[PDB]
Amino acid sequence: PQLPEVETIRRTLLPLIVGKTIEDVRIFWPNIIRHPRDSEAFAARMIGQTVRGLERRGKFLKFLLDRDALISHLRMEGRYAVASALEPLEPHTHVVFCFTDGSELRYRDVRKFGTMHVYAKEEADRRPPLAELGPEPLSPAFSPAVLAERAVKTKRSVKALLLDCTVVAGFGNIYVDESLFRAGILPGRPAASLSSKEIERLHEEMVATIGEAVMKGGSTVRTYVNTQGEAGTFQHHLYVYGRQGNPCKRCGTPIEKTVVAGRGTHYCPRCQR
DNA sequence: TAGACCTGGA
DNA sequence: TCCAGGTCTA
Ligand SMILES: [Zn+2]
């Protein structure tokens, strides 16, 4: 899940939990809880608080309670669902927040990579993991100027730059490869070798891609679905991600898949330079 | 940067 | 065995 997916999850989840009061918190896999470290302290402090809001920061879900904020990262497979406490639990459900109305927020995560941090509302943003987080791609905080200032200060791939949450927030493997394709830039090329026109083109593409992905409800390429188990529709507008060995939608040239920044990387050998 | 941190699907 | 919408590390 990246900005689009998390944003979609956030939108479909909020109305289902807003106003509900946490009566209990069950943890079936303690490692997911990062702060406080003690899974029992994490549970105990949630008890009694009401969900007042659900915000997003980068790829993080920020559950706003009474005095605390629950910072949740779905990582690769984290998923939330709201269901009746009387129904059996689905597999890989590691954390369940029981509400006083008998319903419950269930956190499923097959790979168990997700993380949860609870801090007093005020502390949340100045503490990790939200502390060291780049600006929102859909806000004036993210400008070609910002991307430029970071590109010139590094010799690493423009892909590694974009995948860096400190540079810009919310971009993952799918949207980085897609934005770079749409900007006509090879992902493996040095970030500092990007010209002012390219950087202003990339920025424009990134912002455009993220926005469209948000409208289409995110990209369902493997296991992603919004809170209602509904798949997104942006995967049908993907140019390169996961299309290796398939003709490029623009030029017909077979899409390539290599490894860049340690990640599977897709691109058109002809349309990107 | 090759692995962790985990687990299921091709 | 190879791979994965995330992210740190030796
Ligand atoms: Zn092409």
Side-chain angles (χ1 to χ4, degrees), chain A residues 1-86 88-89 91-131 133-148 150-152 154 156-195 198-199 201-272:
Chain A
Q2 301 152 99
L3 189 153
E5 293 68 41
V6 174
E7 180 51 37
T8 301
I9 283 180
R10 175 190 132 299
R11 291 174 179 190
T12 57
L13 177 56
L14 174 61
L16 306 182
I17 62 182
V18 70
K20 295 184 185 178
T21 308
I22 297 172
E23 171 174 281
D24 198 2
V25 179
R26 300 179 180 180
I27 298 75
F28 308 109
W29 192 254
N31 290 172
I32 286 158
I33 279 58
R34 298 313 180 66
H35 185 290
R37 194 62 216 184
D38 180 1
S39 66
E40 292 173 58
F42 170 96
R45 81 187 282 150
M46 300 288 268
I47 311 290
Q49 298 196 56
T50 303
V51 174
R52 305 297 178 178
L54 186 50
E55 291 175 0
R56 177 188 61 63
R57 189 63 193 72
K59 307 172 187 177
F60 289 99
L61 276 183
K62 185 171 181 182
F63 291 89
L64 300 184
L65 310 177
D66 283 316
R67 61 154 296 179
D68 300 318
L70 167 60
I71 312 305
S72 169
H73 197 116
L74 282 41
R75 284 311 172 82
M76 296 296 295
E77 311 284 333
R79 272 82 206 196
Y80 279 103
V82 172
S84 165
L86 303 168
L89 239 38
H92 311 297
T93 302
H94 305 311
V95 187
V96 177
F97 306 76
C98 306
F99 299 118
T100 62
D101 69 357
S103 70
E104 50 179 45
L105 175 64
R106 299 164 177 187
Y107 174 76
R108 300 185 56 184
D109 188 343
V110 175
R111 306 185 66 184
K112 299 177 170 65
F113 292 169
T115 60
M116 279 176 190
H117 294 77
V118 170
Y119 296 121
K121 286 170 177 299
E122 327 84 79
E123 290 283 300
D125 297 332
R126 294 190 284 75
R127 296 294 307 280
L130 302 186
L133 204 69
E136 292 290 332
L138 304 182
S139 70
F142 187 48
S143 66
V146 171
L147 185 48
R150 290 286 296 181
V152 311
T154 187
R156 59 179 186 166
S157 56
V158 58
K159 172 162 193 172
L161 180 69
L162 281 40
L163 287 180
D164 179 8
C165 64
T166 74
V167 173
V168 56
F171 284 81
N173 209 31
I174 288 174
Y175 299 120
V176 166
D177 286 359
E178 295 286 316
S179 286
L180 287 167
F181 165 81
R182 294 161 67 145
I185 302 163
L186 286 169
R189 65 180 296 199
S193 69
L194 300 185
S195 58
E198 302 191 278
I199 290 184
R201 187 63 208 303
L202 175 60
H203 169 77
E204 168 199 355
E205 285 313 314
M206 293 181 69
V207 169
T209 304
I210 278 307
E212 306 177 15
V214 170
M215 289 186 85
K216 265 71 168 56
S219 302
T220 294
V221 305
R222 303 164 82 288
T223 60
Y224 165 75
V225 296
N226 60 29
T227 300
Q228 280 75 59
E230 300 171 354
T233 67
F234 192 85
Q235 62 276 11
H236 303 309
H237 298 58
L238 296 177
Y239 281 107
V240 301
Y241 185 80
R243 306 195 63 255
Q244 56 269 33
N246 285 162
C248 165
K249 295 186 176 178
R250 181 137 56 177
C251 78
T253 303
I255 296 311
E256 310 278 58
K257 191 189 198 302
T258 56
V259 177
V260 180
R263 309 300 295 288
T265 303
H266 320 65
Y267 66 94
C268 174
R270 164 186 190 169
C271 293
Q272 280 166 281

